[PDB]
């Protein structure tokens, strides 16, 4: 009574959708290194032997797409045909055009930077929860860390049968606590990871429990009833793009809160700051985290929305789940007094011309590494 | 006090992401017409002059991809270079392989149909709300209907300057009502739609208000304070894939609840029933709607999750927002007694081998047309 199960998932750096996100952001970063005002909307598609870039870029930079793509794939670890994909020998195809002049004229041409219009319509949410220090749901934090642990043990050679494509999933039993949530125990863990042709299933399952799960999940959350689904498909030799096509922006829930809070549908990777799908979601996270770390609430969800060409949000809304003594109306006044959610101001507050985006594109965009949107603003009220 | 704004969006049939969803489901349907057991994972990518199919299909069908793709684009309305895209003359590229044998062996080979494994891990949600008869949020219903109205007036020739690519966005002021939500008024509407080179902005804005909004949104929701952003970019002649690359599965929030409820991240289009991203989300909608139409709650969210190769969900969870006299524990017992959420049973209950998927791929998968997942189950308890 008062408890429920909740599940979130994450994926590894070599998951084919995440490959695409990382490549899209490597392209963005390459442009921004040379032209901080590049307009970038770079989608990546991955299938056996192929990376395709499709989208719209207007930029003063001279970018070697072959090098940028191949270096990103090398970093992920796909470096041999035996692994199913090789940065040295794959096809890299480019279908990139300039940004539509109709978009450019309606969004940013002949506009003062602070008054640039949103690059599109849409809705975006930010969320924070006091259940972890980093203000993220435990389900998603643990799922990300399990993938990171796999990559670590692959790269350090202790589990050399590992390959880069992985997925994880964590189910936690939660208790209610005055509108907030408290994690009690881990009910179920799934891990699936691509592997070489030589290792056997029992060796993999033993390693995944002892060297991955136990190295990540605190023992206080694990008990004799916890259910483990380790390599549940039985065989995962074919992987990466060869096993499953990847596309940019197909892991938007992994990128955010693991299903908690809410999501407006927009993808992050491959987009410069004028695309509010990214910048306003980052700003909304920053607002939410600022409210929780400032002691105003324990758990909070912020919605913003925009119209293409219009700088100020059309709507700003807040829900605190009953975890503040202040009304949501009062919290909204505090937010309005402390934040300016025009994209041309967000860019300054969060330093969004800086080429740090490839680092955001695996293991979630939130709750990690003290990115600007993770540093709470001191609120005046 | 007790009120908040909430925004949802929708897109039209010629929006480039939605083009991709529709093509992916046209391909699925073509396979299912000949082989009800086809294994389909068809991604579509669209950019100027190009439809690319990428993914994995194992099927006994003989499908003419050129015809299927081009007929889908014709139906949407892209039939001339003057509109930016033409089904008769575009490039159709195919990068389709068989389903991975490692997946096939772990999911469905040599398994009894009812006991087939989930085609992947993941989490899925179903939602229902009593605020409309179709048990959907008003924000998303209105946003979809505005796009449908644009397509209607394009196809009937009364606004012949319209083209197929459109987006809409609706902000509603809601009041709290004992855990449920009540819509009060429409605060803001956005409409952006591709148009010919001859029509002027004032003609478009007048038509969008008088012939689109007033034909869709009840006057009781509109007042002298409602804000209208009609063609806010000022010019939208370039559109469709030429204006913005499209990909399958990039409108997952438009496809579902417009940001309400929750989303697990999986895309629907291009996937047969063994992909629980689709089948289990449909079943979860069916459960949620059955609970509301059965009088057990006014508003409800259901989560399910799976592991690849495992037939039964790993977790089932329910949240009723305080809108039931029964506890969520009791509702879960009712759900367990009345539903079987194995994919190999869902397929029978919801008739998921039937080639009806292209019809789901615009205007949302839920709340429309009495699809099987929209017909409530009579609950025994
Ligand atoms: O706040 C809550 C509470 C809650 C928290 C503290 C309190 O004092 C009172 C109630 C809650 N309580 C219970 C109890 C039995 N079942 N549920 N369940 C949930 C869910 C959720 C759960 C199961 C499936 C689906 C969504 C969510 C959510 C999660 C993700 C996205 C959107 C909503 N929030 N939430
Ligand atoms: O249930 C509620 C209630 C509520 C309903 C009936 C009651 O008797 C008591 C409370 C509520 N109340 C208020 C009041 C002032 N602000 N909020 N606000 C919300 C939101 C939401 C709102 C603004 C931004 C973001 C999310 C949501 C939601 C919507 C989509 C996804 C997830 C959660 N639910 N919700
Ligand atoms: C299961 S595949 C999706 C379904 C697939 N498109 C098909 O044709 O059936 C989704 C993800 O699961 C992982 N995956 C691929 N092959 C797998 C296998 N043999 N066992 C487990 N997971 C696998 C990869 O991370 C892949 O991107
Ligand atoms: C604004 S575009 C996204 C940003 C774009 N990729 C870029 O290069 O800036 C997203 C969607 O908005 C719509 N759109 C395209 N051109 C537009 C215009 N000139 N005015 C308004 N909306 C437009 C189309 O539905 C398109 O798919
Ligand atoms: Cl996936
Ligand atoms: Cl191998
Ligand atoms: Cl879009
Ligand atoms: Cl024209």
From Swiss-Prot, chains A, B:
One of its GO terms (cellular component) is cytosol. Protein expression is regulated by post-transcriptional regulation: in presence of S-adenosyl-L-methionine, METTL16 binds and methylates the first hairpin of the 3'-UTR region of MAT2A mRNA, preventing recognition of their 3'-splice site by U2AF1/U2AF35, thereby inhibiting splicing and protein production of S-adenosylmethionine synthase. In S-adenosyl-L-methionine-limiting conditions, METTL16 binds the 3'-UTR region of MAT2A mRNA without methylating it due to the lack of a methyl donor, preventing N6-methylation and promoting expression of MAT2A. Mg(2+) binds at residue 17. NCBIfam families: metK. Belongs to the AdoMet synthase family. This is S-adenosylmethionine synthase isoform type-2. Detected in kidney. It comes from the Eukaryota. Heterotrimer; composed of a catalytic MAT2A homodimer that binds one regulatory MAT2B chain. Heterohexamer; composed of a central, catalytic MAT2A homotetramer flanked on either side by a regulatory MAT2B chain. Binds 2 magnesium ions per subunit. The magnesium ions interact primarily with the substrate. It comes from Homo sapiens (Human).
């Amino acid at each position: 009574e008062g408890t429920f199960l909740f599940t979130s998932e994450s994926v590894g750096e070599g998951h084919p959708d995440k490959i695409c996100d990382q490549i899209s952001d490597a392209v963005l970063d390459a442009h921004l290194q040379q032209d901080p005002d590049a307009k970038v909307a770079c989608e990546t598609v991955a299938k056996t032997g192929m990376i395709l870039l499709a989208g719209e870029i207007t930029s003063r930079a001279a970018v070697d797409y072959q090098k940028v793509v191949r270096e990103a794939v090398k970093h992920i670890g796909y470096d041999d045909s035996s692994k199913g994909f090789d940065y040295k020998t794959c096809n890299v195809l480019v279908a990139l055009e300039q940004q539509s002049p109709d978009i450019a004229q309606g969004v940013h041409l002949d506009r003062n930077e602070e008054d640039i219009g949103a690059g599109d319509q849409g809705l975006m949410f930010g969320y924070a929860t006091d259940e972890t220090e980093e203000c993220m749901p435990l389900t998603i934090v643990l799922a990300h860390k399990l993938n990171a642990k796999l990559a670590e043990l692959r790269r350090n050679g202790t589990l050399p049968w590992l390959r880069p494509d992985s997925k994880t999933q964590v189910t936690v039993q939660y208790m209610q606590d005055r509108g907030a949530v408290l994690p009690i125990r881990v009910h179920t863990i799934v891990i699936s990871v691509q592997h070489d042709e030589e290792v056997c299933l029992d060796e993999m399952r033993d390693a995944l429990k002892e060297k991955v799960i136990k190295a990540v999940v605190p023992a206080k959350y694990l008990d004799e009833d916890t259910i483990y689904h380790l390599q549940p498909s039985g065989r995962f030799v074919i992987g990466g793009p060869q096993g499953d096509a990847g596309l940019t922006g197909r892991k938007i829930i992994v990128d955010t809160y693991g299903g908690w809070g809410a999501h407006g549908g927009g993808a992050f990777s491959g987009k410069d700051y004028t695309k509010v799908d990214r910048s306003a979601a980052y700003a909304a996270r920053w607002v939410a985290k600022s409210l929780v770390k400032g002691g105003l609430c324990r758990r909070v969800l912020v919605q913003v929305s925009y119209a293409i060409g219009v700088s100020h949000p059309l709507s700003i809304s807040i829900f605190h789940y009953g975890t503040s003594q202040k009304s949501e109306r009062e919290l909204l006044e505090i937010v309005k007094k402390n934040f300016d959610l025009r994209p041309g101001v967000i860019v300054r507050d969060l330093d969004l011309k800086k080429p740090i985006y490839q680092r955001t594109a695996a293991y979630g965009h939130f709750g990690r590494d003290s990115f600007p949107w993770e540093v709470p603003k001191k609120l005046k009220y």
